[PDB]
Amino acid sequence: LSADSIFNIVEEQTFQYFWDGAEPVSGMARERYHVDGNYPENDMNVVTSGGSGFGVMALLVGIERGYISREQGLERLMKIVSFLEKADRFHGAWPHWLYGETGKVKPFGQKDNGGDLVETSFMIQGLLCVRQYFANGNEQEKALAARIDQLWKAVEFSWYRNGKNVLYWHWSPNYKWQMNFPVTGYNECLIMYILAAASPTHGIPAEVYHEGWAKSGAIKDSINAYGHTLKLSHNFAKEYGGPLFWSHYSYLGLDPHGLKDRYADYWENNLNHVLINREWCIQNPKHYKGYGPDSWGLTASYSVKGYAAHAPGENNDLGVISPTAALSSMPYTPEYSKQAMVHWYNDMRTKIFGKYGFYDAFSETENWYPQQYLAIDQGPIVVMMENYRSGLLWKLFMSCPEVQAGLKKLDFQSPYLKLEHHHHHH
Numbered sequence: 421l422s423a424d425s426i427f428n429i430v431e432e433q434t435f436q437y438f439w440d441g442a443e444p445v446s447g448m449a450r451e452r453y454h455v456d457g458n459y460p461e462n463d464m465n466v467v468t469s470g471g472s473g474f475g476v477m478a479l480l481v482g483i484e485r486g487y488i489s490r491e492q493g494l495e496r497l498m499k500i501v502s503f504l505e506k507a508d509r510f511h512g513a514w515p516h517w518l519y520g521e522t523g524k525v526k527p528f529g530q531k532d533n534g535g536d537l538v539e540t541s542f543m544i545q546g547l548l549c550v551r552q553y554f555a556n557g558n559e560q561e562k563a564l565a566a567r568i569d570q571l572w573k574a575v576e577f578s579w580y581r582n583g584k585n586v587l588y589w590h591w592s593p594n595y596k597w598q599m600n601f602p603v604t605g606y607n608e609c610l611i612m613y614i615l616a617a618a619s620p621t622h623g624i625p626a627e628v629y630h631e632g633w634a635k636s637g638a639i640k641d642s643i644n645a646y647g648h649t650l651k652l653s654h655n656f657a658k659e660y661g662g663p664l665f666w667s668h669y670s671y672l673g674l675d676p677h678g679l680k681d682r683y684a685d686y687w688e689n690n691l692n693h694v695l696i697n698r699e700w701c702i703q704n705p706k707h708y709k710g711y712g713p714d715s716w717g718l719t720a721s722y723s724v725k726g727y728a729a730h731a732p733g734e735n736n737d738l739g740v741i742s743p744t745a746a747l748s749s750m751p752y753t754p755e756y757s758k759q760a761m762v763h764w765y766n767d768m769r770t771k772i773f774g775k776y777g778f779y780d781a782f783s784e785t786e787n788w789y790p791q792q793y794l795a796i797d798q799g800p801i802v803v804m805m806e807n808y809r810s811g812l813l814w815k816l817f818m819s820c821p822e823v824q825a826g827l828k829k830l831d832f833q834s835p836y837l838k839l840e841h842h843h844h845h846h
């Protein structure tokens with residue numbers, strides 16, 4: 421099959437993770453789906469707040485593409501929003517995990533039993549797109565958009581500062597600030613600070629971003645690999661950059677085209693991140709089976725021994741290729757991402773393509789082809805493939821007046837920003 425046909429099959433099948441594969445009570449994205457029905461942790465109906473952020477965006481793609489009808493999409497998104505309104509919130513932030521059937525927190529580790537502002541941010545990036553999509557619809561659609569607007573305005577980003585010039589990832593009603601994870605760059609979390617600056621009700625002053633996230637300029641670096649330079653200081657990953665998903669999550673709604681601030685050119689950094697990851701796979705210094713220009717992309721995913729933050733480098737490449745890395749990079753390296761897609765589909769689909777698209781990860785070296793999926797890995801595939809085609813989520817997210825105001829407050833530039841004209845003196 422041709423690239424154009426395979427693209428459509430891949431996008432549609434991966435979408436179904438979030439439709440057929442959804443938890444049925446909540447309509448939210450499952451943390452995981454195991455095709456054999458075996459869940460070691462009896463956790464099949466635990467839903468991911470961040471992955472469901474990606475999933476609401478995927479629902480919009482399905483409406484646009486005709487994978488579902490507008491009425492299907494609306495009923496589902498109403499079910500999701502109903503769930504989220506009733507679900508456990510901690511100063512406005514959802515927890516990392518909820519039980520789909522009850523809306524109560526499932527602790528992600530003992531002390532992580534309250535708000536998770538980063539996964540909440542991923543949710544909000546997706547809900548804001550839904551809000552923009554339905555804002556001029558019928559009355560029930562407009563009502564939905566308003567219900568989302570209320571959830572948005574209730575997220576208390578300001579609370580998560582704990583009075584400092586940074587944002588904490590967590591807060592618990594009983595463990596208070598003991599998780600103690602101040603979010604400092606560069607990693608996958610940029611969108612949290614953009615949304616915090618954007619909030620009209622519980623926003624942050626800009627120093628929270630420049631001192632906290634950007635470390636008063638120490639986020640700037642220069643990591644050279646294979647002739648490509650990264651100018652952001654990738655946390656713990658200063659040779660090759662982090663797992664490739666860091667160039668995905670915060671860029672599903674926030675368009676990285678022409679996105680720039682005093683710390684970086686985000687298009688160039690994200691694209692260089694991909695290019696370095698791909699070239700590592702091509703050079704294949706560890707001599708793993710099947711690595712090449714037709715099978716590349718290392719990121720966090722299921723792994724031979726459990727789950728690992730795969731990335732370029734001696735210690736991080738475990739011979740595991742995770743299709744979300746190359747596929748979600750579609751906007752940055754479309755012919756290179758398609759190259760892998762086409763080889764995987766035409767040559768490997770018996771082993772690695774299933775009812776919700778490509779499985780999470782595989783190792784040709786270890787003959788390991790798990791029939792397993794994660795929301796956080798399927799969601800960016802649907803979203804970024806669609807953004808490459810149509811810019812659908814980008815156009816929706818970048819159209820939010822609050823997003824534009826947040827970006828201006830943080831001194832970002834973007835071609836989406838409407839610049840105000842001033843005469844010379846007044």
Ligand SMILES: OC[C@H]1O[C@H](O[C@H]2O[C@H](CO)[C@@H](O)[C@H](O)[C@H]2O)[C@H](O)[C@@H](O)[C@@H]1O
Nearest residue numbers: 828837838839840841842843844845846
């Ligand atoms: O609607 C006309 C323009 O309105 C604004 O510009 C006026 O007001 C500004 C602030 O007082 C002045 O600096 C400017 O000289 C005025 O023309 C807005 O900034 C413009 O983009 C509009 O075209």
